[PDB]
Design a protein around this ligand. Sequence first.
Ligand SMILES: N[C@H](CCC(=O)N[C@@H](CS)C(=O)NCC(=O)O)C(=O)O
Lengths: 203, 203
Amino acid sequence: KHSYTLFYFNVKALAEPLRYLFAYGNQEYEDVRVTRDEWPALKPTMPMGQMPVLEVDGKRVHQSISMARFLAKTVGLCGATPWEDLQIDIVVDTINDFRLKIAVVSYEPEDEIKEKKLVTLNAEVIPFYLEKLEQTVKDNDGHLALGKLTWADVYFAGITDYMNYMVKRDLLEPYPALRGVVDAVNALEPIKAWIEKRPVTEV
Amino acid sequence: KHSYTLFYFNVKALAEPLRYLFAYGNQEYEDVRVTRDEWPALKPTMPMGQMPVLEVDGKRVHQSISMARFLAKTVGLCGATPWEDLQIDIVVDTINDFRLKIAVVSYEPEDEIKEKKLVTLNAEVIPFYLEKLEQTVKDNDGHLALGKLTWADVYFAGITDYMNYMVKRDLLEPYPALRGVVDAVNALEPIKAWIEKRPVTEV
Ligand SMILES: N[C@H](CCC(=O)N[C@@H](CS)C(=O)NCC(=O)O)C(=O)O
């Protein structure tokens, strides 16, 4: 019925939550891993010249969070009403805001102003977001939204390795409830099979 | 029969798209405008300490793009399928990405950094985003998505003044199709009535 192709670099990073959602839904897709050398040539064929991109029946889309939301709908990992969908959207937006704050410091400045912001990141931002999310999980019985499995859980499990990579430590060590969410997603049979089969990469 | 309260500062800025959507749907709501003085005392009661905040039957939510998507569903400004909704989501994410890039410059700390970034913003960032959106509108018969009125149009019409305020000029001068989308939303009877009604604020 539907043809799916994912374009990204040979890394997990922002595409890995999409790869998780495809695995979750038993959905065959072509996992195109563009080399650094080949990227100049393929860039003009990507919307806005960025990745990840999905091509769905020949039509290309971008914006990884919105594509994750779409894939979640196709696999029943959303809610039943606009209100429920909003609750999931909010927590994913919060996770993304957090990811962006880490990225801006880690991948951000070339010079060593990184030093001062990294202090603010570690001392204020990281503990602040992770404590909020930890409480959310406790308030929702081991889930990020709606007191049940949703794509917020799958997104978070799919993005945590990247966030860890960017700060160079296990961010979830102090947060057993958040670790519980990630472990529970990673233990789902098709996601487990994907993790075992996927290309081993640093990022 | 549902009770809606919007909390924000006494400005248009980030909440104005939400106010447009309430107007569009003829949905009564409490427009709570938190003055600069009240804010530090009120802040600790708000989710993640930010605004805008929507209260729906007492339940507080935040994240303005996700709240706009929720109001859009409530007033009928979405698509027919998840695929169609994805198209609208992507363009709003793009608009938000652009707005954030403006904001990073506009509120920049040291003046030597602000000035360097402003150069890049004007020469590279602004044309990159707006040229693409301009072409999109031309490819969608005067609309940002689905060749018809969607909440992407309403969002864009409701945020344009804020982007212009931050750069201190009319960003849409080179982009007549984009101005057309804004004028067409602004001319919609319920929106026109709101624009005339609303408090006059600098932002
Ligand atoms: N995630 C943003 C939140 C933006 C936000 O945090 N709002 C600002 C002002 S527009 C704020 O209340 N920040 C703290 C403050 O100004 O006291 C959204 O799209 O709603």
